[PDB]
Design a protein around this ligand. Structure first.
Ligand SMILES: CCCCCCCC/C=C\CCCCCCCC(=O)O[C@H](COC(=O)CCCCCCCCCCCCCCCCC)COP(=O)(O)O[C@@H]1[C@H](O)[C@H](O)[C@@H](O)[C@H](O)[C@H]1O
Length: 307
């Protein structure tokens, strides 16, 4: 299968319970977990990486992991996550135009990788005007866009980055820039954040590698306490709200050459006139690391900056 075309073993320097770094009891639990799912007639997504993500999400409690997997398979089918990429490619023009309309006001882009080879994802929220934003998109539409990105990440970004790093990469490094937002709006979008967390926590286990929140407004940490009840403590332990020294802090995790100049690095686009909010630069754009899955589609249509 496609999995035979890229490393399925994590770096030996990874956390416990990850592919290739299992204890004897974890190996036995994985074998039992798969056996149960197969006997329940499941066939897809039974690979070590996928199954270990669920097992880690439930501390290797096999029955709890079976419940989580069973419910996820249900959701993927009811929500259409299994055909989200195909459906997109069958109505690409219309969908591309929508993303282009929102790109400048709500930058969302991947730009290279972190020191461990994880896709580096950036979001800028300071230019968002809710009134204007909801004239172009709906809340559910934004949620579906995020789910589509989750699928593109697993389908195209994971394989390319794993082949580049020489080992399995299953998580991302995220940087949320809140420069320009008001504490007020942060509280006002809590319901959306809750929807994102619900889908992400329950159906996309162990996908978070690093998560930084920068340029947050005074009092944001207090506002964040409202979000914690929607997140597991493991997830919370991977989210870091940085202050004035964030530039140096980011450089501990990301190569300076990969980090955009405005965030403390020296990274620039081949064409100085291009915009980061139309870019999608990374290993998934390198012929050497693109496999049988094919190259990722250009989410910003003709405006997509791939270099
Ligand atoms: C409409 C505008 C919205 C903007 C504001 C939009 C905010 C959202 C923007 C972008 C979304 C980014 C999503 C990033 C996803 C990263 C990967 C991921 O999905 O990780 C998954 C979780 O993803 C999430 O929880 C998504 C939510 C993360 C925190 C988001 C904080 C947002 C802060 C917003 C601040 C306020 C902004 C205001 C902006 C105002 C602008 C005017 C899995 O986590 P992980 O730890 O790997 O495994 C879990 C497992 O799953 C659980 O089962 C187990 O119990 C537990 O033990 C672990 O095993």
């Amino acid at each position: 299968s496609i999995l035979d075309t890229y490393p399925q073993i994590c770096s030996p320097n990874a956390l416990p319970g990850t592919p290739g770094n299992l204890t004897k009891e974890q190996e036995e639990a994985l074998l039992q977990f798969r056996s149960i799912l197969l006997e329940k007639n499941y066939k897809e997504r039974l690979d070590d990486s996928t199954l270990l993500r669920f097992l880690r999400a439930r501390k290797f409690d096999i029955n709890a992991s079976v419940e989580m997997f069973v419910e996820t398979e249900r959701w993927r089918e009811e929500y259409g996550a299994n055909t989200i990429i195909e459906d997109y490619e069958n109505n690409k023009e219309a969908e591309d135009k929508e993303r282009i309309k929102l790109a400048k006001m709500y930058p969302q882009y991947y730009h290279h990788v972190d020191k461990d080879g994880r896709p580096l994802y950036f979001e800028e929220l300071g230019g968002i005007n809710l009134k204007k934003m909801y004239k172009i998109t709906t809340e559910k539409q934004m949620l579906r866009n995020l789910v589509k990105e989750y699928e593109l990440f697993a389908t195209y970004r994971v394989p390319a980055c794993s082949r580049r790093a020489g080992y399995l990469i299953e998580t991302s490094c995220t940087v949320l820039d809140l420069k320009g937002i008001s504490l007020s709006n942060a509280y006002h979008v809590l319901s959306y954040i809750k929807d994102v967390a619900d889908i992400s926590q329950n159906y996309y286990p162990e996908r978070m590698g690093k998560f930084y929140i920068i340029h947050s407004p005074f009092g944001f940490s207090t506002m964040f306490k409202m979000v914690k009840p929607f997140l597991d403590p493991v997830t919370v332990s991977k989210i870091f709200i940085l202050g004035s020294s964030y530039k140096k802090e980011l450089l501990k995790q990301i190569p300076i050459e990969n980090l955009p100049v405005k965030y403390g690095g020296t990274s620039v686009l081949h064409n100085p006139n291009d915009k980061f909010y139309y870019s999608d630069i990374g290993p998934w754009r390198d012929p050497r690391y693109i496999g049988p899955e094919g190259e990722i589609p250009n989410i910003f249509g003709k405006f997509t900056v791939t270099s």
